[PDB]
């Protein structure tokens, strides 16, 4: 059983050093190239480059800034992805893959990434604990559709997750859509909660969204109105 | 340069057949070998084909690879609900003095479990009170579409903007259709300066557009 087994999740802060590993067994580890592949949550696969355990020759993807490197121990038959100083955008899934395949008729292919590791998930946070700001998403002509209107609460600039939302102290529970959070380049989160309501009632009913963020112990109430 | 271009999404009825293009250069696919990978949600990529059209033992013959000239294709026959995954092509680029590996942009394959539906867009501009706090954000809401795959694109006046955009992965709802959200980050300056901003959403070849101005 040819096997590539990786080291396991790491949660880190921006600026800290890190190593992850990939251990081949049940073959002559020093025979075949090992490569590293990165995948940012929701984005696709990227080639980072490769290492040759035999003589530790490496070839790096043209866009590896030189903060990230590769190494190989002939003793423990293991390969390493290394960082001197992690930053926010290092956050991804990292797989290792060995360059070799053999079909059952003994044929020998030297360019084929058949065997993969389970991945090492790596999280890097670049942000302190911040309670969220809330801003109203007012209903309007452009917002109303027949006898129906959308209004929302923009809950932004918070860390860490999660936040919770409710409308009119829970009394209103339909039809309420609270979307998934988005990660900004500032290291902080945002999300939007929207409700559709009857437009006949837009000038007589009150709408208040309720925002609760436990890590920072903050509660916020915002009244969402039309515009005069 | 160095980018293998794949359509963002593709689709098929069950038992039917879908194909994915993979488009590159003379520096890569034309003369160099090609490989294909399947990536199921949450899981490790699996090698489906190597050296243009050979499939490792253990892989059905309904996966079929072809290549001609500057491009290549992955044929998926006998379309099953378990084929529903992300597909990536790859090959070697030699623009430099050595063997660089490169993956394609990726293709989301959904197996039709219902009928197609185009999305509805609602776009909110920045609120007065966010402007007072000297910040600005445009919130674009994309709802009730199938399959669950869209491309969103923003424009200032009529030109692309890629600064400060993030989009959510689509997820499923109380009409069994998908919804997502996109955010554009701006300065009150930027917002005030331009004629309009637009949020624009492409879905299985159809484009919808909603637009806002600072007035």
């Amino acid at each position: 059983q040819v096997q590539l087994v990786q080291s396991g999740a790491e949660v880190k802060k921006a600026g800290e050093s890190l190593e992850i590993s990939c251990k081949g067994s049940g073959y002559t580890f020093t025979d075949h190239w090992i490569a590293w592949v990165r995948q940012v949550p929701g984005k696709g696969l990227e080639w980072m480059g490769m290492i040759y355990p035999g003589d530790s020759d490496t070839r790096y993807s043209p866009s590896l800034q030189g903060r990230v490197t590769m190494s190989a121990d002939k003793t423990l038959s293991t390969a390493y992805l290394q960082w001197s100083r992690l930053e926010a955008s290092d956050t991804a899934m990292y797989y290792c893959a060995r360059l070799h395949y053999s079909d059952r008729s003994g044929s020998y292919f030297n360019d084929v990434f058949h065997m993969w590791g389970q991945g090492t998930t790596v999280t890097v946070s670049s942000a302190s604990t911040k309670g969220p700001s809330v801003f109203p998403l007012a209903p309007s002509s452009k917002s109303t559709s027949g006898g129906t209107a959308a209004l929302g609460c923009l809950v932004k600039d918070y860390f860490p997750e999660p936040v919770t939302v409710s409308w009119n102290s829970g009394a209103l529970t339909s039809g309420v859509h609270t979307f998934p959070a988005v990660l900004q380049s500032s290291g902080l989160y945002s999300l939007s909660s929207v409700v559709t309501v009857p437009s006949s009632s837009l000038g007589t009913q009150t709408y208040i969204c309720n925002v609760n963020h436990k890590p920072s112990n903050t509660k916020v109430d915002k009244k969402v109105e039309p515009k005069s | 340069q160095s980018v293998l271009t794949q359509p963002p999404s593709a689709s098929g009825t069950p038992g039917q057949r879908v194909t994915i293009s993979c488009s590159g250069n003379s520096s890569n696919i034309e003369n160099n070998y090609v490989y294909w990978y399947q990536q199921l949600p949450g899981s490790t990529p699996k090698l489906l084909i190597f050296r243009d059209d050979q499939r490792p033992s253990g892989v059905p013959d309904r996966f079929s690879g072809s290549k001609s000239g500057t491009s290549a294709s992955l044929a998926i026959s006998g379309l099953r609900s378990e084929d529903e995954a992300d597909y990536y092509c790859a090959s070697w680029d030699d623009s430099r003095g050595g063997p660089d590996y490169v993956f394609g942009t990726g293709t989301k394959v959904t197996v039709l479990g219902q009928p197609k539906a185009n999305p509805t867009v609602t776009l909110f501009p920045p609120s007065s009170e966010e402007l007072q706090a000297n910040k600005a954000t445009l919130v674009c809401l994309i709802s009730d579409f199938y399959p669950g795959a869209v491309t969103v694109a923003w424009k200032a006046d009529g030109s692309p903007v890629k600064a400060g955009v993030e989009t959510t992965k689509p997820s499923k709802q109380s009409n069994n259709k998908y919804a997502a959200s996109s955010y554009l980050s701006l300065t009150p300056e930027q917002w005030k300066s331009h004629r309009s901003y637009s949020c624009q959403v492409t879905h299985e070849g159809s484009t919808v557009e909603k637009t806002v101005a600072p007035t």
Binding site: D31, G54, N110, D111 | N31, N32, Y33, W92, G98, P99
Partner: peptide, 17 residues
């Protein structure tokens, strides 16, 4: 060694060794 990678028909790197 067998550090040899064959990138296509009649095309290789690390041919020696």
């Amino acid at each position: 060694k067998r550090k040899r990678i064959h990138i296509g028909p009649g095309r290789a790197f690390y041919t020696t060794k």
